[PDB]
Amino acid sequence: MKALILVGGYGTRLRPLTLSTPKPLVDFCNKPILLHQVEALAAAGVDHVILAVSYMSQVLEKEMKAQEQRLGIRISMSHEEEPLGTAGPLALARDLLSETADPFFVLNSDVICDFPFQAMVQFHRHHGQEGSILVTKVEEPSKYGVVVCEADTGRIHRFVEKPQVFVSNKINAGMYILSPAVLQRIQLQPTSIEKEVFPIMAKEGQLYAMELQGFWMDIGQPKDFLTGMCLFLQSLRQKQPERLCSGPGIVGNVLVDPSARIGQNCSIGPNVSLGPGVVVEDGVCIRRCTVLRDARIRSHSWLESCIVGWRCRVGQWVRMENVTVLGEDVIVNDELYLNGASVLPHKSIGESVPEPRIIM
Amino acid sequence: MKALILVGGYGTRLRPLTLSTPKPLVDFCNKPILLHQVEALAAAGVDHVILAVSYMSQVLEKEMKAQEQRLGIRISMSHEEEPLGTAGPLALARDLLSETADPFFVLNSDVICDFPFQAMVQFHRHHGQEGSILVTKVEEPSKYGVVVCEADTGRIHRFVEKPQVFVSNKINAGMYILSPAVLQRIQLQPTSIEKEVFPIMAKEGQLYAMELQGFWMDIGQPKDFLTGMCLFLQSLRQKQPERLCSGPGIVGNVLVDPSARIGQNCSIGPNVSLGPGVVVEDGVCIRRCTVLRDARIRSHSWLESCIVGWRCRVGQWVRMENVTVLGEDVIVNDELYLNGASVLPHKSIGESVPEPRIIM
Ligand SMILES: Nc1nc2c(ncn2[C@@H]2O[C@H](COP(=O)(O)OP(=O)(O)OP(=O)(O)O)[C@@H](O)[C@H]2O)c(=O)[nH]1
Numbered sequence: 001m002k003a004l005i006l007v008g009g010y011g012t013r014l015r016p017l018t019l020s021t022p023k024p025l026v027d028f029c030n031k032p033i034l035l036h037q038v039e040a041l042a043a044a045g046v047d048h049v050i051l052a053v054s055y056m057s058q059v060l061e062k063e064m065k066a067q068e069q070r071l072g073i074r075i076s077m078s079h080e081e082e083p084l085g086t087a088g089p090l091a092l093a094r095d096l097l098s099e100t101a102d103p104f105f106v107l108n109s110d111v112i113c114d115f116p117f118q119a120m121v122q123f124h125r126h127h128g129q130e131g132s133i134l135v136t137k138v139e140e141p142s143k144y145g146v147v148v149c150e151a152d153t154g155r156i157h158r159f160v161e162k163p164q165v166f167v168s169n170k171i172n173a174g175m176y177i178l179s180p181a182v183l184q185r186i187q188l189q190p191t192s193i194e195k196e197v198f199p200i201m202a203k204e205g206q207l208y209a210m211e212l213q214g215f216w217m218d219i220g221q222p223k224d225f226l227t228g229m230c231l232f233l234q235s236l237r238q239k240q241p242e243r244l245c246s247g248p249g250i251v252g253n254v255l256v257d258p259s260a261r262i263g264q265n266c267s268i269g270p271n272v273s274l275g276p277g278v279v280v281e282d283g284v285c286i287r288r289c290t291v292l293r294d295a296r297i298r299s300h301s302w303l304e305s306c307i308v309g310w311r312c313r314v315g316q317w318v319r320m321e322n323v324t325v326l327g328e329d330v331i332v333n334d335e336l337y338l339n340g341a342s343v344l345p346h347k348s349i350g351e352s353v354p355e356p357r358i359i360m
Numbered sequence: 361m362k363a364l365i366l367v368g369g370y371g372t373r374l375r376p377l378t379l380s381t382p383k384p385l386v387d388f389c390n391k392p393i394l395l396h397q398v399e400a401l402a403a404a405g406v407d408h409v410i411l412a413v414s415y416m417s418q419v420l421e422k423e424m425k426a427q428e429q430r431l432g433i434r435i436s437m438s439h440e441e442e443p444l445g446t447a448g449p450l451a452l453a454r455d456l457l458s459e460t461a462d463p464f465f466v467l468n469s470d471v472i473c474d475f476p477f478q479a480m481v482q483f484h485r486h487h488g489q490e491g492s493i494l495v496t497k498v499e500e501p502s503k504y505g506v507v508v509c510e511a512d513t514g515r516i517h518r519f520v521e522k523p524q525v526f527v528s529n530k531i532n533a534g535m536y537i538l539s540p541a542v543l544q545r546i547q548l549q550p551t552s553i554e555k556e557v558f559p560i561m562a563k564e565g566q567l568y569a570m571e572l573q574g575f576w577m578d579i580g581q582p583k584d585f586l587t588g589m590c591l592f593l594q595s596l597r598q599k600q601p602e603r604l605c606s607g608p609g610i611v612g613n614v615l616v617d618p619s620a621r622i623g624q625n626c627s628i629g630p631n632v633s634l635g636p637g638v639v640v641e642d643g644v645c646i647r648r649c650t651v652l653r654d655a656r657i658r659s660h661s662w663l664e665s666c667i668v669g670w671r672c673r674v675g676q677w678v679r680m681e682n683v684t685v686l687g688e689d690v691i692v693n694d695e696l697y698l699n700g701a702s703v704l705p706h707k708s709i710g711e712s713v714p715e716p717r718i719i720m
């Protein structure tokens with residue numbers, strides 16, 4: 001049993017992180033999201049995964065070929081020149097998914113959740129048709145495409161792409177299991193699967209919907225990165241509570257790498273990830289922020305709801321609030337205020353940014 | 361006699377273009393800026409030109425070994441692991457510029473002008489001292505650092521970085537002729553030369569200043585890129601008037617590459633440089649704009665004062681004004697309006713941008 005991962009290129013959202021390394025290679029709770037997905041996928045028992053990339057990503061082939069030898073499952077490498085979309089990647093890796101008539105996982109990279117792989121296999125064997133789709137609950141139907149499910153069967157009736165009508169609560173979760181006949185329906189042109197291929201299958205009624213328990217987040221956006229951060233630390237607190245670092249100046253769910261250093265007399269608040277090799281100085285308050293690797297946060301700073309990129313240097317007495325994202329190698333001078341500043345990589349900030357704008 | 365070229369790392373202005381190719385590799389009037397500078401340096405008779413990179417730029421390595429076998433002059437590549445700034449590159453390549461006791465050029469890449477190399481050599485031999493600076497006029501002194509000039513000697517009494525006192529009209533033009541004893545003064549720490557080293561040479565009175573006639577531009581900025589493109593097409597009109605393409609639907613000084621295609625019944629206005637392989641369709645008005653290579657502009661569009669990146673697709677009835685820089689592979693949909701839209705690469709725009717803002 002095989003599994004395709006969609007990890008083509010350039011996540012548009014969260015652009016200051018995607019400009020430096022690819023979107024599946026950014027560090028989500030001190031680990032890339034692709035390592036989370038292939039880690040759970042080898043926990044499922046999938047033999048070999050296949051990864052479909054349009055962007056040339058030599059650092060990603062380096063990481064995945066080290067990870068292929070690290071974990072014990074093989075990794076084949078679907079390579080594309082022109083952006084092939086989301087359906088086209090199944091049709092390039094076509095003959096290999098045609099080699100065995102057995103249902104295969106199809107996964108989006110930007111979703112982090114608690115993966116029910118074998119329960120989804122068991123649902124797909126229990127319903128016995130072509131495609132199985134994973135759906136979740138949200139609180140805001142006016143953002144994502146709603147799907148309507150029948151009770152006790154989970155069959156699709158209609159796939160609706162726009163909101164504001166309220167025919168259904170449930171939302172695409174980005175996990176599919178597909179049969180090879182679905183792949184026979186997919187052509188090599190760059191078209192999207194969820195835009196047309198899932199719509200005719202829903203018009204045939206071929207898809208069925210399986211529901212999750214909870215803890216789902218697409219983290220393709222930076223505010224969605226921070227909410228999925230918050231929910232992943234809550235799920236780690238409730239599954240492996242010895243892995244979060246606890247202490248006297250530590251509040252809530254805090255996960256700290258062993259390479260990370262935390263200074264004397266500072267209160268690190270709830271729902272934070274500190275990357276490997278970060279240096280926190282004295283008097284620094286960190287709440288709901290994600291600090292990626294080798295980023296030094298100097299003394300007496302205050303930081304709320306932010307993404308500090310790799311090898312940054314925020315000075316002393318900087319205030320940082322409202323989901324500002326720093327790119328790689330961003331130096332922030334002393335005594336500055338950042339609110340909504342999406343700062344591009346290799347920038348030096350000496351102004352305060354009172355209002356949300358992009359610094360380049 | 362040789363020349364050092366500051367070439368290295370991530371020009372933060374002109375960023376929509378900098379994120380795809382390096383800053384000396386962007387095409388300025390159907391030619392990269394570095395090919396302009398090395399082309400003029402080989403017209404001067406410089407033996408070998410050394411360029412100092414800190415950003416890993418393998419494509420620059422690639423076009424520079426192609427240009428090494430093109431122009432007949434050797435190219436040496438000083439490599440820096442972390443940023444050494446603009447004085448550090450003098451110190452890293454310092455044993456090569458210490459091999460011969462000649463005065464050497466050191467150049468900024470973002471300056472495009474009519475290069476008076478041998479006149480600067482004659483001026484440096486006449487004044488007979490340590491360092492010679494090129495200076496030029498400006499219309500607003502409140503933007504750039506001013507430098508005072510004595511008549512009939514050209515010596516620099518004082519170097520002022522900050523404006524708004526009006527002691528001098530003249531501005532640094534980005535070309536220096538330096539002795540080996542300047543590079544014995546120079547140090548291996550990432551300091552910049554125009555911060556500290558030129559100020560203590562001006563403090564010793566050791567600097568002298570040579571004045572340009574006209575046609576100077578620093579094109580590190582996109583509006584400055586368009587103004588320098590206007591000035592370069594004016595100087596190209598007065599020097600090689602048979603190289604600019606003339607026609608019935610062509611107004612002003614227009615440079616068209618031989619691979620570029622221009623459709624019927626369209627009005628290409630003044631100061632327009634079309635790159636190699638661009639496709640201008642039927643009824644497109646383009647004034648004051650720079651269209652880089654492989655970019656298609658579909659029918660009935662209107663473009664004024666804009667930089668169209670590589671492999672773009674501007675749709676039909678699109679209006680673009682106010683220095684809207686499109687990055688690489690930007691698909692603008694039909695019937696849109698862009699005013700100041702500084703669009704990042706690999707974007708698709710479906711909305712009008714009425715005010716100047718950054719689209720990521
Ligand atoms: N390999 C390949 N992967 C692609 C291509 N287009 C999209 N993908 C992947 O498709 C998956 C899901 O698509 P999206 O949720 O829209 O993510 P995205 O393509 O990164 O776009 P944004 O997140 O909005 O910036 C992502 O993991 C992408 O990496 C492609 O052309 N080639």
Ligand SMILES: Nc1nc2c(ncn2[C@@H]2O[C@H](COP(=O)(O)OP(=O)(O)OP(=O)(O)O)[C@@H](O)[C@H]2O)c(=O)[nH]1
Nearest residue numbers: 366367368369371372373412413414443444445580
């Ligand atoms: N090779 C090397 N080159 C550098 C470095 N820093 C600056 N340079 C070069 O110094 C030259 C002049 O500096 P600037 O005019 O400020 O240009 P810039 O470094 O591109 O910065 P911006 O144009 O404002 O984005 C440019 O051609 C840069 O390529 C460096 O750290 N390593």
